Design an enzyme around this catalytic site. Structure first.
Site, short mmCIF file in Angstrom:
data_model
loop_
_atom_site.label_atom_id
_atom_site.label_comp_id
_atom_site.label_asym_id
_atom_site.label_seq_id
_atom_site.Cartn_x
_atom_site.Cartn_y
_atom_site.Cartn_z
N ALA A 129 -33.35 -0.40 -26.41
CA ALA A 129 -34.38 0.72 -26.56
C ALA A 129 -34.43 1.56 -26.35
O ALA A 129 -34.75 2.76 -26.89
CB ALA A 129 -35.27 -0.04 -27.38
N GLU A 149 -29.95 5.07 -25.95
CA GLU A 149 -29.43 6.28 -26.96
C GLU A 149 -30.66 7.07 -27.57
O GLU A 149 -30.21 7.79 -28.05
CB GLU A 149 -28.96 5.08 -28.38
CG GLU A 149 -27.80 6.01 -29.59
CD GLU A 149 -27.55 5.57 -30.58
OE1 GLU A 149 -27.60 4.68 -30.28
OE2 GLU A 149 -26.92 6.04 -31.72
N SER A 205 -33.02 8.06 -25.85
CA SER A 205 -33.25 9.02 -24.87
C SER A 205 -32.26 9.87 -24.48
O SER A 205 -31.53 10.98 -23.88
CB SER A 205 -33.36 8.49 -23.29
OG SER A 205 -34.50 7.24 -23.12
N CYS A 246 -43.10 3.12 -29.42
CA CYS A 246 -42.50 2.69 -28.77
C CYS A 246 -43.55 2.26 -27.22
O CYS A 246 -44.26 2.27 -26.30
CB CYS A 246 -42.05 3.81 -28.52
SG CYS A 246 -40.93 4.15 -26.88
N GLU A 292 -38.52 10.77 -17.88
CA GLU A 292 -36.85 11.24 -18.20
C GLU A 292 -37.09 12.62 -19.25
O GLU A 292 -36.19 13.72 -18.49
CB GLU A 292 -36.48 10.36 -18.94
CG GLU A 292 -35.83 9.18 -18.31
CD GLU A 292 -35.60 7.57 -18.46
OE1 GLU A 292 -36.10 6.75 -19.22
OE2 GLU A 292 -34.80 8.06 -20.26
#
Ligand code: HEM
Ligand code: DEB
Length: 397
Positions: A234, A237, A239, A346, A355
């Protein structure tokens, strides 16, 4: 008696928004559409207060969407296992239990080691020299590595995580016979890894979930195993592609990047904008089903009716935001549902942000002369895809 338009309305261009969502926000915030798969019509939600209900209110079942006959944006009907397709009260418990350890404080404390990881990668790239593909050197590798650090995976065997991660993407490049085996191997390793956390504690996330104080709430072994796997995927992709998506916006109006070389403290405020301003999900919602009648403005949806929120539209709601179509790094407020909202908000939202801020802060810090060396017109955007992203991104510093 009317069209029952098919949604997605159109094949997407870059990180552009189909000009139809805008017309719907004024002319029809909540309209019937036909999703590419499943059966019947559904409700496309396009504004924020409406999306906030469909994602917020207890009277909408995601676990209901598991019915093969229920509409959806993707071909293979979602398994009822998935945390996304999890109704309360069980889901509510998972979130409580995992959420106790996945605290914002754990993620901010990861930062220093996440800074140190973007550097190794920005070294590898400078080793290659300019010009260099930002997908190859940064975006693909960086997230998986970050998750490994979250799970506290020893450096050896991180290649497994990379092997398993890439075996789950849309363009897997591997057959059904292969996907089966890598799954087993990865799950078994995770099994033993959780055992080690129970037997001998660690301080990474799995470790904190693995601990059990006798008289109070904790997760099982198979749940802990699966949560890790669930988080891994989850946050991959989304990120990977969200990183190229923010660099892409940052350079296409290069006035932007230079806004951050000027005042680096904007990186977090920037990251929020770009989350709000990026259709990382091209056509959006995981379906939600009214378990009872529920009232939205301008349409009250009836029990049994499936719904679809378009996140990125809400994120450009003309009442909620000003010049929502224009990228502003200096908004006072940013209530974007780019991380979704309510129950299924999320999990990795804080990690997600960590990130991005670390990739951009590093980029600004290491390459104030960063520029897209590919011609814009040449750009290879991924096609027929559920999550928007660039295949490739040659940049020059
Ligand atoms: C830029 C980064 C990310 C974005 C934009 C993003 C976006 C989202 C959105 C919009 C949802 C809600 C989907 C829905 O309700 O229909 C979601 C759910 C989720 N995301 Fe992310 N995500 C990101 C990174 C991550 C990371 C890093 C992790 C894990 C480490 C992660 C794990 C999850 C999980 C587990 C859910 C499901 C939560 C639940 O249903 O209770 N995501 N994400
Ligand atoms: C219809 C759009 C959605 O697609 C899906 O759910 C896909 C069927 C899933 O397989 C995706 C790819 C997951 O495996 C995760 C990587 C991301 C997931 C957890 C999200 O949060 C994400 C926002 C998701 O809801 C949307 C992309």
């Amino acid at each position: 008696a009317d069209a029952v338009p098919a949604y997605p309305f159109s094949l997407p261009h870059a990180l552009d928004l189909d000009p139809h969502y805008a017309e719907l926000r004024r002319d029809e915030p909540v309209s019937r559409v036909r999703l590419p798969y499943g059966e019947g019509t559904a409700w496309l939600v396009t504004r924020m207060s409406d999306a906030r209900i469909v994602l917020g209110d207890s009277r909408f079942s995601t676990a209901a969407a598991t019915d093969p006959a229920t509409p959806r944006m993707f071909p293979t009907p979602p398994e009822p296992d998935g945390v996304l397709a999890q109704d309360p009260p069980d889901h509510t418990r998972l979130r409580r239990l995992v959420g106790k350890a996945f605290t914002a404080r754990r993620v901010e404390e990861m930062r220093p080691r996440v800074r140190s990881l973007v550097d190794s990668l920005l070294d590898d790239m400078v080793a290659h020299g300019s010009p260099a593909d930002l997908v190859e050197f940064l975006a693909v590798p960086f997230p998986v590595a970050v998750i490994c650090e979250l799970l506290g995976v020893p450096l050896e065997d991180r290649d497994l995580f990379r092997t398993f991660s890439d075996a789950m993407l849309s363009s897997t490049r591997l057959t059904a016979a292969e996907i089966q085996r890598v799954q087993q191997d990865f799950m078994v390793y995770m099994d033993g890894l959780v055992a080690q956390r129970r037997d001998a504690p660690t301080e990474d996330l799995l470790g904190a979930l693995a601990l059990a104080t006798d008289n109070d709430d904790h997760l099982t072994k198979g749940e802990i195993v699966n949560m890790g796997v669930s988080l891994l995927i989850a946050g991959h992709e989304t990120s990977v592609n969200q990183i190229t998506n923010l660099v892409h916006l940052l350079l296409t109006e290069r006035k932007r990047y230079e806004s951050l070389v000027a005042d680096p403290a904007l990186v977090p405020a920037a990251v929020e904008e770009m989350l709000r301003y990026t259709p990382l999900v091209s056509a959006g919602s995981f379906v939600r089903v009214a378990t009872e009648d529920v009232e939205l403005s301008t349409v009250t949806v009836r029990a049994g009716e499936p719904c679809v929120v378009h996140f990125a539209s809400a994120n450009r709601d003309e009442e909620v935001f000003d010049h929502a179509d224009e990228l502003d790094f200096h908004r006072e407020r940013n209530p974007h549902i780019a991380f979704g909202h309510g129950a299924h908000h999320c999990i990795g939202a804080q990690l997600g942000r960590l990130e991005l801020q670390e990739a951009l802060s590093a980029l600004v810090r290491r390459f104030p002369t960063l520029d897209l060396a590919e011609p814009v017109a040449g750009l290879k955007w991924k096609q027929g895809m559920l999550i928007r992203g660039l295949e490739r991104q040659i940049v020059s510093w």
